[PDB]
Each structure stands twice: as C-alpha cells, then as structure tokens.
Amino acid sequence: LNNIFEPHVAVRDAAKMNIPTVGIVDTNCNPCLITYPVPGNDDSPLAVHLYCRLFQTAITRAKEKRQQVEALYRLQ
C-alpha cells in the first residue's frame, strides 16, 4: 500500500510487465495480483524485521549454494 492506503502502482505495473511479485499483505490489502502473497502484519517493526531477515537469509543462502554448485561442477 502507498501512503494514501491504495495499492502501490508497482503491483499493477509488474503484472503488466509479467514480473512475478512476492508481497506481504495485511487484512486491508488486496492480494489478487500478487503472485506469492504472504498474509501477515506489515506495521509492527518486529514483523518487518523478521521478514527482512528471512528474505536476506534466503537470498544469500541461494547465491552461496549457486557458487558451491558451480565450483563442484568445475572441479569434478
């Protein structure tokens, strides 16, 4: 949601550009066009910190796994 409590324009624009979206949706949000919605609280700092931690950890772990797999492929 933007600051007028309407959807972020990027949701519709990403749908137009065929870019998948992950999103945190609160009870007053519209999840119809988010590809992978995650229902949850987006206001409490604890919750937002948990989301940031999870996504950062997943991204770094995936990138490290890619590096390890390519290294194994070349070495072996």
Residue 3 binds RNA, judged by CB under 7 A: yes
Can you spell out the DSSP letters for 2-40?
-TTSS--HHHHHHHHTT---EEEE-TTS--TT-SEEEES
Residue 6 binds RNA, judged by CB under 7 A: yes
Residue 75 binds RNA, judged by CB under 7 A: no
Beta strand pairing status for 36-39 and 22-25?
parallel
Q: Return the residues of window 7-36 that contact RNA according to CB under 7 A.
A: 9, 12-13, 16
In whole angstroms, how close is the CB of 14 to RNA at the nearest point? 11
Nearer to Mg ion, 8 or 42 (CB): 42
DSSP-derived 3-state class of residue 36: strand
What, of RNA, Mg ion, none, does residue 9 touch, CB below 5 to 8 Å by kind? RNA
